[PDB]
Design a protein around this ligand. Structure first.
Ligand SMILES: [Zn+2]
Lengths: 171, 49
């Protein structure tokens, strides 16, 4: 998907592995949180441990826990490419670690990723209506003119061009 | 408090009755420990939430 970044969220950390110390028992606990962004998530999958089995309080070890940072951006159809009459169309994009700060509002970007339905909340009734996002696997800037690619032959050609006529090269 | 006399004609096997119980939630696995049980032939209704 190609478009222009209209809004970026803040970069937030999302806990993927929390480590908890029990001062009463001296025990250390680790809990894993799997990435259920577009999967079904039962509530057992999202509980944060606060008590020991016999209700001793746990203290979370922040430095030992693992977080991955998470961002959401919205990509809009580029104004120069949108049909000149009507209102713009957008898509939401989830950026996860390594990809978060790659785009800022007003940037023209390609986002490669998986287009997916997000789960709604638990409920006994549903409209059949699903909220879709693009889960990025790659983000690249339009400025393929702001990053060059020099091979050994290119460098050699440049060096010879500069050495040959180092006087009227400017002209 | 009553005081009565009598002859004992049956004595059941000694069994186990809880004085304190702990219950665990099926989904979040959190526990609700050391609930005190009433003594005697009295039961207990678990919390429904
Ligand atoms: Zn529970």
């Amino acid at each position: 998907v190609e478009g222009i970044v209209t809004k970026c969220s803040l970069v937030r950390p999302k806990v993927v592995r929390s480590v908890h110390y029990c001062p009463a028992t001296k025990k250390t606990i680790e809990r894993r949180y799997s990435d259920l962004t577009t999967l079904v998530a039962f509530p057992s999958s999202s509980v944060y441990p606060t008590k020991d089995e016999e209700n001793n309080p746990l203290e979370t070890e922040y430095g030992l826990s693992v977080y991955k940072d998470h961002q959401t951006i919205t990509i809009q159809e580029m104004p120069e490419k949108a049909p000149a009459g009507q209102l713009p169309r957008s898509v939401d994009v989830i950026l996860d670690d390594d990809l978060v700060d790659k785009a800022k509002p007003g940037d023209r970007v390609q986002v490669v990723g998986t287009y997916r339905c997000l789960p709604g909340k638990k409920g006994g009734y549903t409209s059949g209506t699903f909220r879709t996002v693009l889960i990025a696997c790659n983000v690249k800037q339009m400025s393929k003119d702001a990053q060059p690619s020099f091979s050994a032959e290119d460098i050699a050609k440049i060096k010879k061009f500069s050495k040959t006529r180092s006087k009227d090269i400017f002209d | 408090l009553v005081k009565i006399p009598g002859i004992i004609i049956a004595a059941s096997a000694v069994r186990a009755k809880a004085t304190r119980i702990s219950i665990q939630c099926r989904s979040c696995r959190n526990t609700l420990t050391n609930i005190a049980m009433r003594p005697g032939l009295e039961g207990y209704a678990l919390p429904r939430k």
